């Protein structure tokens, strides 16, 4: 039975030998098929992105990128809250998880954030988070 939990477990499975597009797309499709979907999606994603296992984090970031590239006010708005953004910031800041996270994972997050400031100007907290990151010297 494919809930968001099962789908994300499949889409970010450390054992995947290559990106599992069927599962990644299925997660994005399934998350809007419910009022409470978007917040659950985002809580699950935030935890996977923080994994010490890189390939797990990297796959989770691909899911997030993929879902964000598609239309959907609710999901876009959830990711656009500090409640989610704070989870991404912890990954890139030396005060939190940054000193133990690969540059691959960190830079992917910073580029994703930038892309959303350009593609989704209405999500003003995304831009605020990114401006903080520049002032604090994360974004070089």
């Amino acid at each position: 039975p494919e809930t968001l939990e099962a789908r994300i477990n499949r889409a970010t499975n450390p054992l995947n030998k290559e990106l599992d597009w069927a599962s990644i797309n299925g997660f994005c499709e399934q998350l809007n098929e419910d009022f409470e979907g978007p917040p659950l999606a985002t809580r699950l994603l935030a935890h996977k992105i923080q994994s010490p296992q890189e390939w797990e984090a990297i796959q989770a970031l691909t899911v997030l990128e993929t879902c964000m590239k598609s239309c959907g006010k609710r999901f876009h708005d959830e990711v656009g809250k500090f409640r989610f953004l704070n989870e991404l910031i912890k990954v890139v800041s030396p005060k939190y998880l940054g000193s133990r996270t690969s540059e691959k994972v960190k830079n992917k997050i910073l580029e994703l954030l930038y892309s959303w400031t350009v593609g989704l100007p209405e999500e003003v907290k995304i831009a605020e988070a990114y401006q903080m990151l520049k002032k604090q010297g994360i974004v070089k």
Binding site: K81, L85, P94, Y96, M132
Partner: peptide, 7 residues
């Protein structure tokens, strides 16, 4: 919503 994280 939460406050923006302090880093």
């Amino acid at each position: 919503d939460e406050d923006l994280l302090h880093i």
